[PDB]
Design an enzyme around this catalytic site. Sequence first.
Site, short mmCIF file in Angstrom:
data_model
loop_
_atom_site.label_atom_id
_atom_site.label_comp_id
_atom_site.label_asym_id
_atom_site.label_seq_id
_atom_site.Cartn_x
_atom_site.Cartn_y
_atom_site.Cartn_z
N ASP A 65 -7.49 23.90 -31.81
CA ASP A 65 -7.06 22.70 -31.10
C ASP A 65 -8.04 21.54 -31.23
O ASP A 65 -9.03 21.46 -30.50
CB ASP A 65 -6.91 23.10 -29.62
CG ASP A 65 -6.15 22.09 -28.80
OD1 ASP A 65 -5.92 20.96 -29.27
OD2 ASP A 65 -5.78 22.45 -27.66
N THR A 66 -7.73 20.60 -32.13
CA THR A 66 -8.59 19.45 -32.34
C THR A 66 -8.49 18.43 -31.20
O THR A 66 -9.35 17.56 -31.07
CB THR A 66 -8.34 18.77 -33.72
OG1 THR A 66 -6.97 18.36 -33.82
CG2 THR A 66 -8.65 19.74 -34.85
N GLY A 67 -7.47 18.58 -30.35
CA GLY A 67 -7.28 17.70 -29.22
C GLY A 67 -7.99 18.21 -27.97
O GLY A 67 -7.88 17.64 -26.89
#
Lengths: 99, 99
Positions: free
Chosen positions: B25-27
């Site tokens: 999850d880059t967010g």
Amino acid sequence: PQITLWQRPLVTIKIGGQLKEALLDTGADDTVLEEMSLPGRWKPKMIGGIGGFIKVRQYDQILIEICGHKAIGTVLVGPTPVNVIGRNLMTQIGMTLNF
Amino acid sequence: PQITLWQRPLVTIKIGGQLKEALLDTGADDTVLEEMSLPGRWKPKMIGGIGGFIKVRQYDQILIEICGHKAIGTVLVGPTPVNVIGRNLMTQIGMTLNF
Ligand SMILES: CCOP(=O)(COc1ccc(C[C@H](NC(=O)O[C@H]2CO[C@H]3OCC[C@H]32)[C@H](O)CN(CC(C)C)S(=O)(=O)c2ccc(OC)cc2)cc1)OCC
């Protein structure tokens, strides 16, 4: 190019004649943006994450310009605390995770 | 390796000697895992999400393998829809976004 993860991967998108800053989010299935007006029909939907669910309006076939590319994808509009670009749109511009 | 985004970027992680499935999850700034037992003392942390804030247990310097790569860092345990690997750990394994 290569985008580091030391900081939040922010980008500026062009959608519906507006410039919005959003988060390139691999954990997001779809692109979710704060309240805004978009054309065409929509369907109500409930999306969940950390903290629970929020109700959004689902718009399909929306043209969005990101990183110079002109992609097409689904945009969920609702009371999200942060704008995020989902996998739905990232795949279209050829973005991938690498290590 | 390279991971496309057509499907959820789910990977196998190892923590506490057990294998688990987690979403890259880059967010997510932090790594949030489903209820589990971890050693030592924990500190409280309030993190925001799409549905609001939640309280989680913060464990530091925790050994965790992601896609076979070794990392030692902060792990948050709490009510999350799925185990999420955030930028704090993805940076440790040299992962980036590319296009
Ligand atoms: C309540 C106020 O909170 P906040 O402090 C931060 O607001 C957010 C909200 C959502 C995200 C994206 C998700 N990351 C996140 O929650 O990160 C957590 C862990 O790291 C910390 O740092 C960022 C916020 C903590 C994640 O990447 C994607 N989610 C799915 C998964 C986490 C379950 S999602 O946003 O729920 C979602 C997107 C698209 C969908 O389409 C179907 C579904 C669901 C980031 C920041 O407000 C600032 C104004």
